[PDB]
RNA sequence: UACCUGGUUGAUCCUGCCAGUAGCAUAUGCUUGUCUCAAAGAUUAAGCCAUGCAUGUCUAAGUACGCACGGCCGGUACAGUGAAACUGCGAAUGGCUCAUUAAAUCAGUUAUGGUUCCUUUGGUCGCUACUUGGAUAACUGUGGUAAUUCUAGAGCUAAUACAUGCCGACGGCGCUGACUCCCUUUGUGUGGGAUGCGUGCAUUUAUCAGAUCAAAACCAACCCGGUCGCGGCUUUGGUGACUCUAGAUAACCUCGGGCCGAUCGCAGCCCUCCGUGGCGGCGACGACCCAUUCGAACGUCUGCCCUAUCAACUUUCGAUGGUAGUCGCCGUGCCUACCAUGGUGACCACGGGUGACGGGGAAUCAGGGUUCGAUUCCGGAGAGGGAGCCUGAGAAACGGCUACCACAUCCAAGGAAGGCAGCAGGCGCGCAAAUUACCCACUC
RNA sequence: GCUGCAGUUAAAAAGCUCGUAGUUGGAUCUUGUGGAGGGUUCCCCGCCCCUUGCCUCUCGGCGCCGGCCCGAAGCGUUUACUUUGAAAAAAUUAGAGUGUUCAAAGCAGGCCCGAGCCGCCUGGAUACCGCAGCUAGGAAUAAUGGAAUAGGACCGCGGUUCUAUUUUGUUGG
RNA sequence: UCGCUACUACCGAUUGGAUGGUUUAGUGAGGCCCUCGGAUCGGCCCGCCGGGGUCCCUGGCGGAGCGCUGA
């Protein structure tokens, strides 16, 4: 039977970009309900023992999190399967280090340490616009936040830079032809380039083009574009190799020349 | 035209009112009834007949209460005996891949034809769109009639 | 029951179709003597790992340069 | 129980379908309300996801509106006369949507009088004299034409309507499902609907 | 590795099949040293089941007078550990099997502008009060029956259970109009105006508006540049598309049957000042509606094995459609009343069979194909057969309840109790399938 | 036996013709040069009449010294076909990297200081995913269409009619 | 053709037997809904006692309509 919501998640059926093994055991953490979709999230448990190696078994994650050390967007989260996701800024005070969840160019999250004078603001993508009771205009971002009284020029698909202690958006980039963008869905995942186009098929999945810093172009769907810069100048810091998605015939050459077989 | 109520209940368009003010027109005047109509989108021009006409159909996509959304299809007419709705046919080719050859198939569909279009004939092509379920087996409303293929409706002085 | 295991495994040889054929038996017996192997199967392994290389080589050579 | 499933009944081609599962709960039926007339009796039912739902039996009063004058007043409901779908609901006086009812029409008279300073359907001049004429004629001189001439050229209650008040019962149409909102609201007949239903009532019954 | 070989004749050339040959998976026979992996009551009987176990849960933070243990003597809200018991939550996931089921289920593709959503995340939280009511469990004591996770009577007492109900800060505005104040008696041009009713969000009905468009000429009142007849001006948001969102008006209101805190734990302060008046922090909990999340539900296009010794089928016992309702979470013959006579078929309808649950996949494979998929991932369906329902955000739930059918257990013959297609185990069935072991250390 | 069998005599062409569905259908409606990549003509531009085929605009950026020039909006009569993009769960399959002591497997692992580095490097690719639906180029082959008792284009004009809401400041006639 | 021995299916008096599914006619457990019903348990209205105040308000005991009202 299914008569209600499920609550376990099998290890094989889990998302691929979690990069889980196969022979530990039958289950996977099953992210809890949150602001980020179940396939797009990264639970806090998978970030501390599969990536940062800080813990070793699930109980060590539970007793790291209980001591109130970890902060997800300023607030102090105690749930180990909390669904962190794209544009969230984990902070570990007791160590003095910070991170930004951004897709690496193979289409998966990777650790990306940032300077503590940067981990005070995060970007959000506008999803909806509506006028509440008494005539107040609202906003909905990709991570479920609701901003009341936003500027009357910010529209859908735009990006806004908020603060983590107030909300209260500060800057906003407008979606049009010429601005930077990072792609967050499908085949082209974690690539960067100027938008350069947008076609519009009314009633079905408008399509968007892009263009890398090496001529490479790659279409996508508009609901997968995420503007991160005014133009050619990304606001937030970037991972190494900057979304350039080199082919395997190049990846082999760099592996051979660097001879990165040790340290 | 002025007599349209034939059922056991009064037929009127909702979202439309009959005021009772300013009685002076003289020897005749306005019918005392405006018309409700809306646009469909996607590039479909509402037929002038829907505007100027005087009829009631809660399902007509140009005046009544339905929204067009999803698939758009087209097919040739094959029967119109049920009232306000017709039966159309769609022919296509399945592909048997053991052999490298096609095979002919067809499927019949019931659609709903508003009284806006009035001059349809068996053989006409019609372009239809997707609605909410309007009956047991009807999911599609007629959006645009045409006789644009040969053996056309009228002879060659049009 | 669901279980934490790999069922993945595979065979590493293929018996010959003609079971009693002299041109075959004398060649393989020669190859067993000259390298000191144990069964015929120790030869059919090598035959397999070569005949499988020669399929990738061929399917590449039938691509365009 | 009773159910509103699609799968119990046959397809376009006229061929049966064999049962696919046991009746689910989300296909649930429940029996008719059959609102009668009388002192209020409202029950409630729990529907999918909490969400109280008020079933109404034995109603008496309705918040009817008068579209031309923008008035609307809680009014007693006197009777049902015509039912546009089945006729044996008027023989048993069940009160459902788009029924046709007679109401009391008194508060509309009171509003019209006090607003336009004029008389509606009356019989004589004897009853109006001992009281309620102290409202029609006033102390006022300033105001009494400064506004009451703004109420002149407008008091032209239609003949079909004016003929009704002389009995004190008005034809009205329900616009709310009593069995799902507990209330029996609606509007009062104007214009051409009036002629329609006058014809229909005089035609069928009697 | 794109392959053949024996057999009709006295001999020959053919058609043609039977036999050999290689893999695979179920059974079985003979044999067995090492070491790493690891399938295993599917086939027959979705047949029947002895015993044990598989679902419980407490923090600084709902309710502590068990002396049950307890310390420095005191509860003077009251310490502190805390059994039990009320309260909350979960029990609808997981596991097992493959009987049903052929446009059904299922897959890819799309839609909710036609709906519901416990929880999480973010919004939203101002039209006797220094704190109200009566009544239960655990506990004390008396009991009944052969018997059960059976329960009766009496004596006490809690709340985040149950049930009532304030204070603040309204100075709001609209409609009303006794009046009074100037110029026109009036009418019409003036400004105040006490007295009165409505005046938060949500629910239900009805109405209103939801602007700009291309220019001129005569008549009345008229802004402004300024005077006793001319040039110059106008107002949320969104969609491909709304009977959307926001706004205005007149009302309506669910009580016993919507909301705006009579709840709980750590850490502090000011006093026209001496503990009261006052105010400052951090949480736990609950809650209306909106969004978001996990879904769920219904719907569109295309896709199926064998059968003509199944050629016409469907319909007042709704079959296809229209109008109005009932019902339902919403769309809908879903169901009722009236009306029309329709819908499907040689491009195989409808009926029948399937040792048929669908798919991701498996075996063999020059190229094309043939056969398999009960079986660890995803979807569906069912707990002996059929049926009905309680509680809940979620069930037509069987480790829930009620009744009939078939089985079966206990008895003091009055009555009571039951569901291994969970894990082991047993009978039966058969060619055919493991121990009534150990443990929450790993994944969750 | 689609690639791919057979029907005189070996198993087998209805006794004979007509005929609706089904399957199959004759020919025909535009070519050379100046530059570009590849040679010694021929295969992104425009030229014999055409070359993305035009239009006419309007609102907003790109130019020159207002005036005039070119990108976008309409789509070209419709399909099938072919090519490219988008979007498609993992495991299994093919395939890359990595001495499990080799292999089947697995997703790991690799480096130097004796500890005094309180560490460093790097991986967890990629391809496939029929049909049906979505998206943009090509126009050979195959369906399909335009005026024959006509109606195409130029502001060409007369008759006749409904009607839009702007300006003359607004409000009203 | 007749005659022998083994095996396979066919027809058929019995109007076979069983099993399962259909189905007209009649009955119909049990739950839900509705219209009733009212076992029983309360509160406010009149005395005596204790508190306040000028006989009323509280708390208790008893009794009269138990009148009304609630579950
Ligand atoms: Mg389950
Ligand atoms: Mg079930
Ligand atoms: Mg979780
Ligand atoms: Mg709810
Ligand atoms: Mg012979
Ligand atoms: Mg011989
Ligand atoms: Mg053989
Ligand atoms: Mg062998
Ligand atoms: Mg082992
Ligand atoms: Mg096996
Ligand atoms: Mg079995
Ligand atoms: Mg047992
Ligand atoms: Mg405690
Ligand atoms: Mg305590
Ligand atoms: Mg409990
Ligand atoms: Mg629960
Ligand atoms: Mg088992
Ligand atoms: Mg079933
Ligand atoms: Mg069938
Ligand atoms: Mg069948
Ligand atoms: Mg289908
Ligand atoms: Mg699907
Ligand atoms: Mg589907
Ligand atoms: Mg919970
Ligand atoms: Mg909240
Ligand atoms: Mg007691
Ligand atoms: Mg209907
Ligand atoms: Mg209806
Ligand atoms: Mg017929
Ligand atoms: Mg027919
Ligand atoms: Mg059938
Ligand atoms: Mg199968
Ligand atoms: Mg079966
Ligand atoms: Mg193959
Ligand atoms: Mg299967
Ligand atoms: Mg089976
Ligand atoms: Mg099994
Ligand atoms: Mg399953
Ligand atoms: Mg699904
Ligand atoms: Mg059983
Ligand atoms: Mg619950
Ligand atoms: Mg059940
Ligand atoms: Mg269960
Ligand atoms: Mg039970
Ligand atoms: Mg029982
Ligand atoms: Mg059981
Ligand atoms: Mg068992
Ligand atoms: Mg045996
Ligand atoms: Mg075995
Ligand atoms: Mg056995
Ligand atoms: Mg554990
Ligand atoms: Mg042959
Ligand atoms: Mg012969
Ligand atoms: Mg022959
Ligand atoms: Mg012949
Ligand atoms: Mg030809
Ligand atoms: Mg592999
Ligand atoms: Mg390997
Ligand atoms: Mg496949
Ligand atoms: Mg395709
Ligand atoms: Mg094309
Ligand atoms: Mg002409
Ligand atoms: Mg015999
Ligand atoms: Mg015999
Ligand atoms: Mg027989
Ligand atoms: Mg029988
Ligand atoms: Mg019978
Ligand atoms: Mg009956
Ligand atoms: Mg009964
Ligand atoms: Mg009954
Ligand atoms: Mg009652
Ligand atoms: Mg009663």
Curated annotation (Swiss-Prot), chain A:
CDD domains: KOW_RPS4, S4
Biological processes annotated in GO: translation
Classification via PROSITE patterns: RIBOSOMAL_S4E, S4
Protein name according to UniProt: Small ribosomal subunit protein eS4
Magnesium in keyword set: no
Quaternary context: Component of the small ribosomal subunit. Part of the small subunit (SSU) processome, composed of more than 70 proteins and the RNA chaperone small nucleolar RNA (snoRNA) U3. Identified in a IGF2BP1-dependent mRNP granule complex containing untranslated mRNAs.
Record key words, sorted: Acetylation, Cytoplasm, Isopeptide bond, Nucleus, Ribonucleoprotein, Ribosomal protein, RNA-binding, rRNA-binding, Ubl conjugation
A cellular component annotation (GO) from this entry: nucleolus
Presence of keyword rRNA-binding: yes
Residues annotated as domain S4 RNA-binding: 42-104
Subcellular location field: Cytoplasm; Nucleus, Nucleolus
Function text: Component of the small ribosomal subunit. The ribosome is a large ribonucleoprotein complex responsible for the synthesis of proteins in the cell. Part of the small subunit (SSU) processome, first precursor of the small eukaryotic ribosomal subunit. During the assembly of the SSU processome in the nucleolus, many ribosome biogenesis factors, an RNA chaperone and ribosomal proteins associate with the nascent pre-rRNA and work in concert to generate RNA folding, modifications, rearrangements and cleavage as well as targeted degradation of pre-ribosomal RNA by the RNA exosome.
The species this protein was found in: Oryctolagus cuniculus
Swiss-Prot record, chain B:
PTM entry text: Citrullinated by PADI4.
Positions bearing N6-acetyllysine: 38, 45, 58
PROSITE patterns per UniProt: RIBOSOMAL_S17 (PS00056)
Residues with Citrulline modification: 22
Keyword entries, A-Z: Acetylation, Citrullination, Cytoplasm, Lipoprotein, Methylation, Nucleus, Palmitate, Phosphoprotein, Ribonucleoprotein, Ribosomal protein, RNA-binding, rRNA-binding
Molecular function terms, GO-annotated: rRNA binding; structural constituent of ribosome
Alphabetical list of InterPro entries matching this protein: NA-bd_OB-fold, Ribosomal_uS17, Ribosomal_uS17_arc/euk, Ribosomal_uS17_CS, Ribosomal_uS17_N
PTM-bearing positions, type Phosphoserine: 67, 110
Domain of life of the organism encoding this protein: Eukaryota
A GO CC term assigned to this protein in UniProt: cytosolic ribosome
Modified residues (Omega-N-methylarginine): 69
GO BP annotations listed: translation
Residues the record lists as N-acetylalanine modifications: 2
Chain coiled-coil ranges: none
Pfam families from the UniProt entry: Ribosomal_S17, Ribosomal_S17_N
Covalent lipid sites (S-palmitoyl cysteine): 60
Subcellular location: Cytoplasm; Nucleus, Nucleolus
PANTHER family: 40S RIBOSOMAL PROTEIN S11 FAMILY MEMBER (PTHR10744), SMALL RIBOSOMAL SUBUNIT PROTEIN US17 (PTHR10744:SF52)
Oligomeric form and interacting partners: Component of the small ribosomal subunit. Part of the small subunit (SSU) processome, composed of more than 70 proteins and the RNA chaperone small nucleolar RNA (snoRNA) U3.
NCBIfam families recorded: PRK08572.1, uS17_arch
Entry's family note: Belongs to the universal ribosomal protein uS17 family.
Name by which UniProt lists this protein: Small ribosomal subunit protein uS17
Species assigned in the record: Oryctolagus cuniculus
Lineage summary: Eukaryota, Metazoa, Chordata, Craniata, Vertebrata
From Swiss-Prot, chain C:
DNA repair found in the keyword field: no
Gene Ontology cellular component terms for the protein in this record: cytosolic ribosome; cytosolic small ribosomal subunit; nucleolus
Subcellular location as annotated: Cytoplasm; Nucleus, Nucleolus
A Gene Ontology BP annotation from the UniProt entry: translation
Alphabetical keyword list: Acetylation, Cytoplasm, Isopeptide bond, Nucleus, Phosphoprotein, Ribonucleoprotein, Ribosomal protein, RNA-binding, rRNA-binding, Ubl conjugation
MF terms in GO: rRNA binding; structural constituent of ribosome
Keyword hit for Ribosomal protein: yes
Record text on subunit structure and interactions: Component of the small ribosomal subunit. Identified in a IGF2BP1-dependent mRNP granule complex containing untranslated mRNAs. Part of the small subunit (SSU) processome, composed of more than 70 proteins and the RNA chaperone small nucleolar RNA (snoRNA) U3.
Function text: Component of the small ribosomal subunit. The ribosome is a large ribonucleoprotein complex responsible for the synthesis of proteins in the cell. Part of the small subunit (SSU) processome, first precursor of the small eukaryotic ribosomal subunit. During the assembly of the SSU processome in the nucleolus, many ribosome biogenesis factors, an RNA chaperone and ribosomal proteins associate with the nascent pre-rRNA and work in concert to generate RNA folding, modifications, rearrangements and cleavage as well as targeted degradation of pre-ribosomal RNA by the RNA exosome.
Family the UniProt entry places it in: Belongs to the universal ribosomal protein uS4 family.
Protein name (Swiss-Prot/TrEMBL): Small ribosomal subunit protein uS4
Residues of the full protein shown: 1 to 65 of 194
Curated annotation (Swiss-Prot), chain D:
Keyword Membrane: yes
Post-translational modification Phosphothreonine, affected residues: 129
Chain ranges passing through the membrane: none
Alphabetized PROSITE patterns for the sequence: RIBOSOMAL_S8E
Keywords, alphabetical: Acetylation, Cytoplasm, Isopeptide bond, Lipoprotein, Membrane, Myristate, Nucleus, Phosphoprotein, Ribonucleoprotein, Ribosomal protein, Ubl conjugation
UniProt membrane topology term: Lipid-anchor
Region (Disordered): 1-26
Compartments in which it is found: Cytoplasm; Membrane; Nucleus, Nucleolus
Residues found modified as Phosphoserine: 159
Glycyl lysine isopeptide (Lys-Gly) (interchain with G-Cter in SUMO2) crosslink site(s): 169, 192
Lipidated sites in chain (N-myristoyl glycine): 1
Keyword Ubl conjugation attached: yes
GO BP terms, alphabetized: translation
Residues annotated with N6-acetyllysine modification: 36, 127
Pfam family, one: Ribosomal_S8e
One function term, GO molecular function aspect: structural constituent of ribosome
Biased composition (Basic residues): 7-25
Superkingdom of the organism of origin: Eukaryota
GO cellular component: cytosolic ribosome; membrane; nucleolus; ribonucleoprotein complex
Family statement: Belongs to the eukaryotic ribosomal protein eS8 family.
Subunit (UniProt): Component of the small ribosomal subunit. Identified in a IGF2BP1-dependent mRNP granule complex containing untranslated mRNAs. Part of the small subunit (SSU) processome, composed of more than 70 proteins and the RNA chaperone small nucleolar RNA (snoRNA) U3.
Record's protein name: Small ribosomal subunit protein eS8
Organism: Oryctolagus cuniculus (Rabbit)
Gene from which the chain derives: RPS8
């Amino acid at each position: 039977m299914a008569r209600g919501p499920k609550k376990h998640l099998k290890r094989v059926a889990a998302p691929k970009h979690w990069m889980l093994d196969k022979l530990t055991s039958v289950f996977a953490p099953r992210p809890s309900t949150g602001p980020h979709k179940l396939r797009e999230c990264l639970p806090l448990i998978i970030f501390l023992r599969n990536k940062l190696k800080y813990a070793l078994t699930g109980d060590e994650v539970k007793k790291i999190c209980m001591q109130r050390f970890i902060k997800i967007d300023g607030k102090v989260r105690a749930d180990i399967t909390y669904p962190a996701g794209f544009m969230d800024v984990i902070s570990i005070d007791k160590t003095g280090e910070n991170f930004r969840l951004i897709y690496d160019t193979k289409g998966r999250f990777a650790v990306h340490r940032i300077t503590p004078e940067e981990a005070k603001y995060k970007l959000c993508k506008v999803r909806k616009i509506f006028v509440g009771t008494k005539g107040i205009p609202h906003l909905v971002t990709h991570d479920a936040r609701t901003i009341r009284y936003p500027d009357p020029l910010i529209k859908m698909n735009d990006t806004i830079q908020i603060d983590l202690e107030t909300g209260k958006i500060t800057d906003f980039i407008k979606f049009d032809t010429g601005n930077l963008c990072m792609v967050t869905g499908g085949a082209n995942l974690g690539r960067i380039g100027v938008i350069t186009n947008r076609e519009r098929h009314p009633g079905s999945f408008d399509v968007v083009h892009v263009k890398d810093a090496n001529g490479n172009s790659f279409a996508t769907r508009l609901s997968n574009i995420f503007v991160i810069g005014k133009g050619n100048k990304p606001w937030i810091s970037l991972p190494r190799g900057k979304g350039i998605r080199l082919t395997i015939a190049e990846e082999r050459d760099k592996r051979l020349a660097a001879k990165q077989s040790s340290g | 035209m002025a007599d349209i109520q034939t059922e056991r209940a009064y037929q009127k368009q909702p979202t439309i009112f009959q005021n009772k003010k300013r009685v002076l027109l003289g020897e005749t005047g306005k019918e005392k009834l405006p018309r409700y109509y809306k646009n469909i989108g996607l590039g479909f021009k509402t037929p002038k007949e829907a505007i100027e006409g005087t009829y009631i159909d809660k399902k007509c996509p140009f005046t009544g209460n339905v929204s067009i959304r999803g698939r758009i299809l087209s097919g040739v007419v094959t029967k119109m005996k049920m009232q306000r709705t017709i039966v159309i046919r769609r022919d296509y080719l399945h592909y048997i891949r053991k052999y490298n050859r096609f095979e002919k198939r067809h499927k019949n569909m019931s659609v709903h034809l508003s009284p806006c279009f009035r001059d349809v004939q068996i053989g006409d092509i019609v372009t239809v769109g997707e609605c909410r379920p309007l009956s047991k087996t009807v999911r599609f409303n007629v959006l645009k009639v045409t006789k644009a293929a040969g053996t056309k409706k009228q002879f060659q002085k049009f | 029951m669901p279980v934490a295991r790999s069922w993945v495994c595979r065979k590493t040889y293929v018996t010959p179709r003609r079971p009693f054929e002299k041109s075959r038996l004398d060649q393989e017996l020669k190859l067993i003597g000259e390298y000191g192997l144990r069964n015929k199967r120790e030869v059919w392994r090598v035959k397999f790992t070569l005949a499988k290389i020669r399929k990738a080589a061929r399917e590449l050579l039938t691509l365009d340069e | 129980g009773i159910s509103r499933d699609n799968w119990h009944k046959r397809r376009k081609t006229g061929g049966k379908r064999k049962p696919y599962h046991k009746k689910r709960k989300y296909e649930l039926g429940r029996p008719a309300a059959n609102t009668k007339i009388g002192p209020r009796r409202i029950h409630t039912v729990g529907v999918r996801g909490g969400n109280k739902k008020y079933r109404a039996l034995r109603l008496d009063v309705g918040n009817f509106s008068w579209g031309s004058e923008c008035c609307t007043r809680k009014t007693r409901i006197i009777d049902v006369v015509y039912n546009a779908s089945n006729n044996e609901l008027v023989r048993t006086k069940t009160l459902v949507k788009n029924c046709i009812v007679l109401i009391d029409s008194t508060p509309y008279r009171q509003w019209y009088e006090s607003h336009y300073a004029l008389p509606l359907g009356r019989k004589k001049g004897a009853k109006l004299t001992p009281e309620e004429e102290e409202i029609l004629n006033k102390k006022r001189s300033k105001k009494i034409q400064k506004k009451y001439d703004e109420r002149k050229k407008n008091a032209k209650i239609s003949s079909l309507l004016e003929e009704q008040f002389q009995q004190g019962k008005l034809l009205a149409c329900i616009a709310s499902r009593p069995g799902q909102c507990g209330r029996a609201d609606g509007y009062v007949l104007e214009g051409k609907e009036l002629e329609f239903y006058l014809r229909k009532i005089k035609a069928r019954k009697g």
